[PDB]
Amino acid sequence: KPKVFKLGSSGSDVKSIQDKLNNYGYAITADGKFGPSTDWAVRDFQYKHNIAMDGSVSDQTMNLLNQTPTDATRVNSVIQPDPNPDVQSLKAAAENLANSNDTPTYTKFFIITSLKEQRVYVFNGDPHNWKLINTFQCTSGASDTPTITGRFYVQGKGLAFDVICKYYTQIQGNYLFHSILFNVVDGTLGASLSHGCIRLAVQNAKYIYDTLPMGTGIWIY
């Protein structure tokens, strides 16, 4: 078979894969060792290119990595804060929260959901140097199907999933961030159908979907 590079691979070919991922905007260390950050970047790359998301690089992925990036395929690992006035209002407190705690991540982003506040905070930067780029309200799971707590990584995504939700981002298994249910479906019925998921205004689910690459750290508490 053709050569396959994956988690654990090393050498100058890996280094060039990493250089190409950096050209695509993934901001990883190009050291020639295919670690988790390279795996996650490859998975995101594959998702954005509508090819199988397995985290391995063979001919198909390599061919695409050799194309010039475009607006459709390039990741921005620096994002300017949203102009929503709540960003500025909560900036200091949210940044203090993120910077003073463990925030494991494989991207230049991090997302916190505080269940007691029913609020989401989205950051750009690195551990202990996070900048708040967005914040918004959420609705998490009802008490009989509560949202999972813990630390996770963005695992998967989709544009949509007899009711529909838009712009889902997978936390773990069936626990997702997604839009309000759709004609809007809310109330006790909306909570029963959403189970443990985190519901957001459509624009905010879309924001997470558009901004956070696979491997972005997640903290829910």
Side-chain angles (χ1 to χ4, degrees), residues 3-5 17 34 42 46 55-59 61-62 65:
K3 192 59 72 77
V4 182
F5 303 96
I17 288 165
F34 200 128
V42 170
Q46 290 165 336
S56 286
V57 181
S58 193
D59 293 345
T61 295
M62 186 73 84
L65 282 168

Side-chain angles (χ1 to χ4, degrees), residues 5-114:
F5 303 96
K6 56 191 295 192
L7 187 72
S9 293
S10 67
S12 56
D13 286 332
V14 172
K15 206 286 201 200
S16 290
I17 288 165
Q18 294 167 329
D19 291 333
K20 293 163 192 180
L21 290 161
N22 285 338
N23 190 33
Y24 276 87
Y26 289 100
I28 60 172
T29 300
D31 60 4
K33 283 175 278 194
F34 200 128
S37 73
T38 302
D39 176 284
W40 281 119
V42 170
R43 294 185 198 251
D44 195 81
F45 179 94
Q46 290 165 336
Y47 183 82
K48 286 182 92 77
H49 286 79
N50 298 302
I51 61 169
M53 182 176 71
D54 67 353
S56 286
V57 181
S58 193
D59 293 345
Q60 185 186 45
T61 295
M62 186 73 84
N63 180 58
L64 298 170
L65 282 168
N66 286 335
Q67 299 181 327
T68 308
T70 66
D71 273 359
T73 58
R74 198 184 51 86
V75 167
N76 288 302
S77 278
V78 178
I79 293 292
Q80 295 308 298
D82 189 275
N84 177 0
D86 297 353
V87 173
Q88 269 299 325
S89 299
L90 301 180
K91 180 180 178 67
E95 291 176 2
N96 286 344
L97 171 67
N99 289 333
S100 60
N101 278 291
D102 296 345
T103 60
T105 186
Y106 291 106
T107 68
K108 302 310 195 183
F109 301 87
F110 198 75
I111 183 170
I112 296 178
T113 305
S114 174

